[PDB]
């Protein structure tokens, strides 16, 4: 969904689920196997921890918050209204030209039928 919040939340959940099973799994199955798993698990957990640190810097600071955004929207609302008027000023010129040319063509057709 390309959302910062979704990615951060997902990473935390994997760590919780991934580490709860892993500790239990270590207790579950006992030379070569125990040592390799220790590194494999430490590796992932370490990777997840690094990822979490990277994520925090990306989010916006205390400044330019929601109230400020609403304030920004205000000034913007007035600007939008003006923009709308532009098109309502542009229109009706085509309408008057169109009614003029319809009157002209009706007059031409009438003259053509009356000259007979």
């Amino acid at each position: 969904m390309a959302d910062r919040l979704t990615q951060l939340q997902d990473a935390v959940n994997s760590l919780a689920d991934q580490f709860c099973n892993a500790i239990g799994v270590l207790q579950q199955c006992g030379a070569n196997p125990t040592e390799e798993y220790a590194q494999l698990f430490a590796a992932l957990i370490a990777r997840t921890a690094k990822d979490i640190d990277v994520l925090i810097d990306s989010l916006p600071s205390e400044e330019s918050t929601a109230a400020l955004q609403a304030a920004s929207l205000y000034k913007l609302e007035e600007e939008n209204h003006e923009a709308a008027t532009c098109l309502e000023d542009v229109v009706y010129r085509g309408d008057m030209l169109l009614e003029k040319i319809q009157s002209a063509l009706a007059d031409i057709a009438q003259s053509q039928l009356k000259t007979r």
Binding site: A66, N80, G94
Partner: protein, 159 residues
Amino acid sequence: MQYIKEYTDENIQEGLAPKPPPPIKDSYMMFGNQFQCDDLIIRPLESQGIERLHPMQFDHKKELRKLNMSILINFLDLLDILIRSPGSIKREEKLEDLKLLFVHVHHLINEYRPHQARETLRVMMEVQKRQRLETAERFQKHLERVIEMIQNCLASLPD
């Protein structure tokens, strides 16, 4: 399955005798399992049912960086507190403590979304203005083509 009868039977009759709809309530609503209390803050509230250890500043970023080490250190402390004391009761409070920590991270992270939600709203207002201007200019351009055309016709007619 059961429809209401004694509040609906008085509908087929004319005049102003039909009852008005109920005005808008300003009290707590008891419908459903959920409490659904009126005028609840949009942000989730941890004030009730959750202990508060948060700072006056209420900055998520400062806490997030500190919280991460604490959950991790506890994870490591919970690993060996089992061997240091297997029969001790404090292990399940540590899990609970861990559960409390899990309740906190999600609660603190959710703080950002309302601000994030507000940002989505501004582009909609902003994009239309970016779109409306283009339509007006395009319309003006189209009209111009027509006018220069009728001037060419008016130039070629009387000669």
